[PDB]
Point group: C2
Chain length 287, copies 2
């Protein structure tokens, strides 16, 4: 019983390919998910990053369901690994392949997944079957649109690169916990590790803003919003990778957000104009 | 019309896996072939090596044909690339996979190839279809058993490693032609390149021998057979790789053979006892 299938908009994925090539090593061992409404589900990839971080690439409107699916009108949630064990098959690698003509993903019994890839020469194809076994990993990203007032920071290229150079030169063989804090009194965020610190000041926006709109901005000055002092102590490896993964040239630039729920999020803030169906971020877990 | 299929003895390939892992980068872009009798065909992989060399791994008795094939009793010859263009599918990579449970290759119209792989979890599988388009590359290896008297050389580990160290330290960015010659008068083989040479002497066997049996031997002395002076001028890149590819620890050790037909062959001479169904060599083309 073929309960649910979807056709993959490969043309859309091509335009987004650059984002996938930048995060590919981090997501090779990841989890691929198909979730949201049965009508227009989201395609997303997740994977751990360093000791306590979680990457999430989420692509809306890249899928069209096949007519005659049993379970409709409500939601959908299929979660599997993109690289099945033993295999030489990486879903996202092939979904984003350059020489890909068409692609589809089917589900059936919710324990099995079939991905069909059709290559350039209108002749070569691959049909990979596997198990849907990552039900524990939820699609917990394209959410929490309300609330607003959150403590967030957006650093420019110059400051952002300088912050990264500094971070990695503190790195050793073993991981360390970095405490990141934000002062509302002084408009300052400090990175503290071992016995050294990095201080960065920012211009706080008076006007009440939401998300990142109205903080760009990032030409030569560092901007931020803060309503309570914040303090987080996250994994250094996760931080480096997070800041490196969300810096996608011609696409995203890192933004830090302090969630009410102990979580520091590194988010790719769109620098361009063709990443509307895409969200990229890394949740840094409190250590 | 499913004209011809074969079941792959993965258990046998496992025991041989070590040979495949050593030549994998050289064969990634290679050609896979199924040839010989329809009853027991040979599985082999070919690929160029440097500017003018041809690697050939050939495995006998690793295949069992499926009952009901149209064309029988006579021979078979199917030649395709192991990495189809655009794909993330390498036949040999998956045929030799560790977590492989079973595998089969089918042919049908002689233009199409299907390889079915079944992984460890008796659940994951891959079905890759492609085109049989390398008809020009013939299976020209497990042949020429007669003739005999050929000029051949077998160097020990010490001499062989010293020869390789010397070769690669002559290497530059650009390739050069190395002339390799053999003197019957003096039992000596010399490697000449640019303006430097390496001289190696060997003990020639009186007793008339065939193939490599009766020249092993390779404990601490270099052995050889020569009936006419030989001179070859092959590609240096090809020579290095050839000597490096045919040196498989616990399996093969390089042997040089001067064929009557302008061709210098670098052959993996079995060092062990479990490589009976396998032949590995590289044909060095005259430059």
């Amino acid at each position: 019983d073929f309960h649910y299938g979807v056709r993959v908009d490969v043309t859309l994925l091509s335009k987004i390919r650059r984002v996938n090539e930048h995060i590919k090593s981090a997501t090779k061992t990841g989890v691929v998910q198909v979730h949201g409404s049965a009508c227009t589900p989201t395609l997303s990839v997740l994977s751990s990053v360093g000791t306590a971080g979680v990457l999430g690439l989420r692509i809306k409107n890249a899928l069209t369901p096949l007519v005659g699916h049993t379970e409709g009108s409500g939601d959908v949630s299929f979660s599997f690994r993109n690289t099945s064990v033993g295999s030489g098959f990486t879903h996202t690698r092939e979904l984003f392949g350059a020489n890909v003509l068409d692609a589809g993903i089917a589900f059936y019994r919710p324990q099995f997944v079939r991905t069909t890839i059709s290559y350039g020469d209108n002749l070569t194809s691959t049909v990979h079957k596997s198990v849907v076994d990552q039900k524990g990993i939820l699609p917990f990203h394209d959410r929490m649109e309300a609330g607003g007032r959150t403590t967030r920071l957006l650093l420019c290229g110059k400051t952002g690169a300088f912050l990264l150079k500094w971070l990695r030169q503190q790195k050793t063989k073993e991981d360390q916990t970095v405490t990141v804090s934000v002062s509302e009194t002084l408009s300052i965020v400090t990175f503290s590790l071992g016995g050294v610190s990095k201080i960065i000041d920012f211009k706080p926006e008076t006007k009440p803003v939401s998300g990142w709109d109205g903080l760009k901005g990032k030409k030569s000055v560092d901007v931020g919003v803060v309503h309570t002092d914040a303090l987080s102590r996250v994994s250094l490896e996760s931080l480096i990778a997070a800041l490196r993964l969300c810096k996608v040239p011609g696409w995203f630039t890192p933004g830090l957000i302090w969630h009410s729920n102990e979580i520091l999020e590194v988010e790719g803030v769109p620098t361009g104009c063709q990443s509307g169906d895409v969200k990229l971020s890394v949740l840094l877990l409190e250590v």
